[PDB]
Amino acid sequence: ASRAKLATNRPFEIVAGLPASVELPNYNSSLTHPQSIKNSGVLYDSLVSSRRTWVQGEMFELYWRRPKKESPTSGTIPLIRDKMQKMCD
Amino acid sequence: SLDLSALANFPSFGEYDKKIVHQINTEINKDLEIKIKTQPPTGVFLANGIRKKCLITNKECQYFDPRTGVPYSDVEAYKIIQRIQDPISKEEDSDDQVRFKWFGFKNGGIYLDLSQRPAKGVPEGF
Amino acid sequence: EGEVTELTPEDAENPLGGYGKTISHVIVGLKSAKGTKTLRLDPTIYESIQREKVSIGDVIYIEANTGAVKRVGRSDAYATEFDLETEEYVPLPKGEVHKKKEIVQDVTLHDLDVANARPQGGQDVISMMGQLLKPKKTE
Amino acid sequence: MKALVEEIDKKTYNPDIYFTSLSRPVKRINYSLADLEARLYTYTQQEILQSDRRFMELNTENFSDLPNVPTLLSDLTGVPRDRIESTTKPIVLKPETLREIQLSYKSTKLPKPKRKNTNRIVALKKVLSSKRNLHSFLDSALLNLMDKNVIYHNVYNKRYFKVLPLITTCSICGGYDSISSCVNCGNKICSVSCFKLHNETRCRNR
Amino acid sequence: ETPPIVIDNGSYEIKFGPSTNKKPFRALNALAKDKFGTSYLSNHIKNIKDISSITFRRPHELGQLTLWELESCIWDYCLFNPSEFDGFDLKEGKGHHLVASESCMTLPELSKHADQVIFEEYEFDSLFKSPVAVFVPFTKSYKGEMRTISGKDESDYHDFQLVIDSGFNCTWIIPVLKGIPYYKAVKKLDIGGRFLTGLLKETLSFRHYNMMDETILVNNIKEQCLFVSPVSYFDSFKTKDKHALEYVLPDFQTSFLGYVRNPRKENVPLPEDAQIITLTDELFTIPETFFHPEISQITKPGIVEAILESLSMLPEIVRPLMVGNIVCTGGNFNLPNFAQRLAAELQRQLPTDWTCHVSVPEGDCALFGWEVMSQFAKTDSYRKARVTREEYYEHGPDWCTKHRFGYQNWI
Amino acid sequence: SKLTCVKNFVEEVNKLRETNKQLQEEFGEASFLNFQDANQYFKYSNKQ
Ligand SMILES: Nc1ncnc2c1ncn2[C@@H]1O[C@H](COP(=O)(O)OP(=O)(O)O)[C@@H](O)[C@H]1O
Ligand code: BEF
Ligand SMILES: [Mg+2]
Ligand SMILES: [Zn+2]
Ligand SMILES: [Zn+2]
């Protein structure tokens, strides 16, 4: 959210922190000095974001999370292990 | 000399196509040196010598794409990235080809193929 | 002659190429009433530039005959850059940046004799002390 | 002539800083709650924005169109209207227009009418009954982001900004023989008469 | 068979007439109303007596012709009425070949509307329209009389030419390559005649009594007496008294329009009741905004910056020829010493190897666009390029503006 | 004084001059008219 508030009238919008538009990008019409994808990395940022989100997104309802650390809360780890049965990969 | 041949290719008060604009941008880009402040990360290795893990497959990265700068584990990974690029698959059933689109989710975004056949039973308008 | 627009000293392509600073050619951009020209200069000419204390915008004057650099002054374009400053503002040189002229002068034989007898060259302290001396005629 | 011996204080002396200084006469103080609020809250972006707004104001011909500038400037630049309205300090069609056109019809005499109907003719009426302004066109979704940005912005210069030299002139009369900056706001003056004029009419700190 | 009709839809004056005609007509494309609500149209504006506060409504909001209603009114007045315009009369429009002009960068929707209305409503047989810079290279087809100046001293169209179109709205830098402008290198200088008239208003109102409303008075001043400094701003400012001029204000009982006098030259005495405004610095300090926008506190880059950028964005092999073949046109260029100074500055900026040859038409430079457009219309290139009424009918309305004429085809 | 290199300058000047003579033969009637062809301008610029 703290990402730089884009200057007015850019041919893109910042969606999920990245430059995007509803229509297919027309770089050739719109850009005079396009930085390479190497230079931009936008694709890279998108891919990393995608993977991470898939690791952390809302697709499936969360039910257990490893507790962020003679606290008996350690003893609950085997209990949570036993409350589930183990199945193949 | 080759530019002179290119110049003869330029539109001559006719009905010429957009492709010229690519050459135009090529000439325009020459205006000034590029003040790229920070070079982008490159290569398939981390600073400690451990191989990077593929963002697509989670396999250990073997090769690095010099054009885009996205390292990739396998040919499949590279092909998938390229299909993410080249949104108009210029084969010219064309609409049935894998078309990945990006959807914005809380705190991030994901790529979704609108040509993905959903599970059997989806209603009309699904 | 002209007004300096750029001054980008370059070093040798390899550090082993030269000694110490290893300063290679310097590139200078001069502006005149008829256009601009980018020159490639010897490191000696760069040393002359450093001696004359030339900055960007100063009107300069280089003689390819001897490699002597003269600082005419500051361009009248930058006259009002500062509202109080001691600078001899000079106009932009007319004509081309690189003008070749044939010079004709009448000199007496006695002039050559005097030049040999009492040369004006030298920048040493001994030279300056001799310069301060009266020019007494000698046989 | 020149003092060969100088006395110095190690606390006050440095080559970095050289400094020397001397109906009730007293320095003015500004009770501007807005300016104080700005101070506590905080060319520059505001300066260039003000200059651009002044340029656009000076471009327009009719005085009556002056209070319509902020909307057009917000549409052209893309900036919010409230920001330009508040931070920056400055300085259409009706049926009556149709009636004036009917009065204007008296000059033309030749054309003759006809009749037909189709949806194409309906759209023909629709273009000739738009009554919408350039602001509507620029805000209209039919003008795409790339099209708009190319057409307005790409024709503007982006790399060269000043290659001729910079020339400063008197703020009153454009003179250049002598220049100095007024103590009150730092705008530049050339003569005593111009100083009196700046003090009476011009100076912006009062 | 009929000669083509050519109209130049200026944002300030409209130059039109049959291709057979020698010199075009004039049409002030502006709807006016006076303080008492009485409305004046086109050349009636020149007939106003209550100059003081006449308000001008125009179809070009910001150089883009948005409001059709008054455009249609002005078109109908100029096309139909023969009595004022030397008997010229567009009877009913059908079966008439029309070549027009428009702003070089028009919105696709606006151009679509323009083509649609001009085709369906007017029912012309064929139509061409494009910026004047498209017609400029065609000047080879006729024996023009255009004076030229070089900056280094004191098959019916030219392939390489650079066009500076300085009109009422804005100053355009349009490089045309073999008759199609290089649209990605097209650069706009926002300074233009409207801005310059506003700056005249401002400086007159500051130095003398408030003339902020006296639109036609300041316009007549601008017509009578402006010039760019022959060498530099300093040179003109040094001899301000020697080149000083005084403009006589309009006297409603004798002359609704004012006039300029040269104080040094011998001339008739002015009546004691006539108010006089002397001009000693605004003659040249106002036009100098073109080269030094800082003078009138404008942050935009100036004309030399814009021209040099446009030259830079061009292909390297062709840019020197473009430098040598730069041609100036438009209403603003008619003011004295603009072409000479622009040429001098351009040569001073460019490398010594290249040479710039500046050619500007003699006489009123505003009429040049109509002349070159007409001389192009009478060539085989116009016959090949022109699009017919039925061909438009065959295509959907966006097709014409997106392919034949508008920028969209390339970009 | 014995090792002066005037011959080197003269020889290179003659090799340039013969190349220029061949180029002028190829071009034909040289002129300083306003250029309307890339080839013509390039050849004139090379000549100068
Ligand atoms: N005699 C003149 N002196 C100075 N400027 C003039 C003169 N005649 C016309 N102009 C300028 O020409 C402009 C009109 O040019 P025009 O060809 O109508 O341009 P456009 O195509 O933008 O409408 C006016 O704004 C005016 O400033
Ligand atoms: F009609 Be113009 F060129 F403003
Ligand atoms: Mg025009
Ligand atoms: Zn002053
Ligand atoms: Zn002040």
Short mmCIF file of C-alpha atoms and ligand atoms in Angstrom, two decimals, chain E residues 10-13 15 167-169 193 222-223 331-332 334 366, ligand 1:
data_model
loop_
_atom_site.label_atom_id
_atom_site.label_comp_id
_atom_site.label_asym_id
_atom_site.label_seq_id
_atom_site.Cartn_x
_atom_site.Cartn_y
_atom_site.Cartn_z
CA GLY E 10 -8.29 27.80 -38.93
CA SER E 11 -9.00 28.14 -35.22
CA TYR E 12 -8.92 31.91 -35.76
CA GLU E 13 -9.57 32.57 -39.47
CA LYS E 15 -9.20 30.21 -45.56
CA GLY E 167 -0.97 29.14 -35.76
CA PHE E 168 -3.49 30.72 -33.40
CA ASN E 169 -3.73 27.71 -31.09
CA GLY E 193 -0.92 33.28 -30.98
CA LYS E 222 -0.56 42.67 -32.21
CA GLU E 223 -1.24 42.93 -35.94
CA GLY E 331 0.28 33.12 -38.87
CA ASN E 332 2.87 33.72 -36.17
CA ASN E 334 4.71 36.63 -40.40
CA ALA E 366 -1.08 32.38 -42.87
N1 LIG G 1 -0.43 40.82 -39.36
C1 LIG G 1 -0.22 39.95 -38.35
N2 LIG G 1 0.75 40.17 -37.42
C2 LIG G 1 0.96 39.31 -36.41
N3 LIG G 1 0.26 38.18 -36.22
C3 LIG G 1 -0.74 37.84 -37.07
C4 LIG G 1 -1.04 38.73 -38.20
N4 LIG G 1 -2.06 38.16 -38.88
C5 LIG G 1 -2.38 37.01 -38.23
N5 LIG G 1 -1.59 36.82 -37.16
C6 LIG G 1 -1.66 35.69 -36.21
O1 LIG G 1 -2.16 34.54 -36.90
C7 LIG G 1 -3.04 33.82 -36.04
C8 LIG G 1 -4.10 33.12 -36.88
O2 LIG G 1 -3.47 32.17 -37.73
P1 LIG G 1 -4.33 30.99 -38.39
O3 LIG G 1 -3.77 30.68 -39.76
O4 LIG G 1 -5.79 31.35 -38.24
O5 LIG G 1 -3.92 29.80 -37.38
P2 LIG G 1 -4.84 28.53 -37.05
O6 LIG G 1 -4.63 27.61 -38.22
O7 LIG G 1 -4.24 28.02 -35.76
O8 LIG G 1 -6.23 29.08 -36.90
C9 LIG G 1 -3.65 34.86 -35.13
O9 LIG G 1 -3.78 34.33 -33.81
C10 LIG G 1 -2.65 36.00 -35.11
O10 LIG G 1 -1.99 36.04 -33.84
#
